[PDB]
Design a binder for this molecule. Structure first.
Ligand SMILES: Cc1cc2nc3c(=O)[nH]c(=O)nc-3n(C[C@H](O)[C@H](O)[C@H](O)COP(=O)(O)OP(=O)(O)OC[C@H]3O[C@@H](n4cnc5c(N)ncnc54)[C@H](O)[C@@H]3O)c2cc1C
Ligand SMILES: NC(=O)c1ccc[n+]([C@@H]2O[C@H](COP(=O)([O-])OP(=O)(O)OC[C@H]3O[C@@H](n4cnc5c(N)ncnc54)[C@H](OP(=O)(O)O)[C@@H]3O)[C@@H](O)[C@H]2O)c1
Length: 295
């Protein structure tokens, strides 16, 4: 019964930004912001795993209106306020060099948001998606593989799982299963939510496992940069075993560049046990326990 598109892209909800706290601490790379909007009075309800769209002002080169962009929701259904009045996004300002002219180029909607001023009205659409929904089963297991801003939904799971206030507010959902987040980022200053993430590993040690793949501070066995799939291979067998359990849901959010690695590792660990991942997986997917959201 997931609520979808309570706001079409042609009648966006206009909400005021509440805060735009920065997530990349000194020294890290780029900019990644934690923007919280205020939905009060709009009836825009959503559930962990979904994502909303933001429509920047302006028009493109071709003179047409700037089409919306998606963004995984980073807050739970209650918002960081635990009052059902807000919603928050985890947004990295896009910034690259022109394939030919060297000129630095920033992204449109991403710079718009990363620099959005608290108190500014922002066009919001959605929520959409039913592929990253967290199972209601408190006894389920959650393996989470994400990179960069891909942590956004993982935050919405983890929070709804271990953040006290949430526990208090969600009597029906008192997590007891096992969760494991393999988080891929460039540097330590870039470990988005490092504070809370590592905090939850305190409160609930036997229920949350945080593995980091800090790409530019860690080298993998082959000499290369430590990426998610490397970690996923380091604890391959374990993961595989934890994946065979029928109460285990896996969630992947980030660059499809990982899918290849993750499949490679898991498929191998699945061979030692005479099993064909490519097919077993096809099932997890059909079963609805292989949630993948890449961009
Ligand atoms: C389901 C989904 C979830 C998402 N979740 C998040 C999230 O939580 N956080 C987040 O930031 N984004 C997320 N995004 C991405 C979001 O849609 C936008 O792509 C992003 O925020 C950039 O917006 P922009 O307007 O700055 O992009 P634009 O400025 O419009 O840039 C996009 C264009 O830039 C060009 N381009 C990009 N890089 C280069 C380069 N290296 N060299 C040459 N050309 C280049 C390409 O032509 C591309 O079409 C998500 C996307 C989807 C599909
Ligand atoms: N995070 C994402 O899932 C994602 C999604 C789409 C686009 N991007 C691009 O990167 C920016 C990401 O910013 P962000 O905060 O989302 O993420 P981020 O902070 O850049 O984190 C991305 C992480 O992904 C790692 N990575 C790079 N190539 C990979 C690959 N081949 N396979 C697996 N992991 C890989 C990176 O390693 P190195 O950087 O050290 O190579 C880095 O540690 C975007 O603006 C866009 O340019 C990222």
């Amino acid at each position: 019964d997931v609520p979808v598109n309570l706001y079409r892209p042609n009648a966006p909800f206009i909400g005021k930004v509440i805060s735009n706290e920065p997530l990349v601490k000194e020294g890290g790379i780029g900019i990644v912001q934690h923007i919280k909007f205020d939905l009060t009075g709009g009836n825009l309800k959503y559930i962990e795993g979904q994502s909303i769209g933001i429509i920047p002002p302006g028009v493109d080169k071709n003179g047409k209106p700037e089409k919306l962009r998606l963004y995984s929701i980073a807050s739970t259904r209650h918002g960081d306020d635990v009052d059902d009045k807000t919603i928050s996004l985890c947004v990295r300002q896009l910034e690259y060099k022109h394939p030919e002219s060297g000129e630095t180029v920033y992204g449109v909607c991403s710079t718009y948001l990363t620099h959005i001023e608290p108190g500014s009205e922002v066009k919001i659409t959605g929520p959409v998606g039913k592929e990253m929904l967290l199972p209601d089963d408190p006894e389920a297991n959650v393996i989470m593989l994400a990179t960069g801003t891909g942590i956004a939904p993982m935050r919405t799971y983890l929070w709804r799982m271990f953040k006290d206030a949430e526990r208090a507010a969600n009597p029906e959902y008192q997590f007891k299963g096992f969760s494991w987040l393999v988080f891929g980022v460039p540097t330590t200053p870039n470990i988005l939510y490092k504070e809370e993430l590592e905090e939850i590993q305190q409160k609930y040690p036997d229920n949350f496992r945080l593995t980091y793949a800090i790409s530019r501070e860690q080298k993998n066995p082959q000499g290369g940069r430590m990426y998610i799939q490397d970690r996923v291979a380091e604890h391959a067998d374990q993961l595989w075993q934890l994946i065979k359990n029928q109460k285990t849901h896996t969630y992947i959010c980030g660059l499809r560049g990982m899918e290849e690695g993750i499949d490679a590792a898991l498929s191998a660990a699945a061979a030692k046990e005479g099993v064909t991942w490519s097919d077993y997986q096809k099932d997890l997917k059909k079963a609805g326990r292989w949630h993948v959201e890449t961009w």
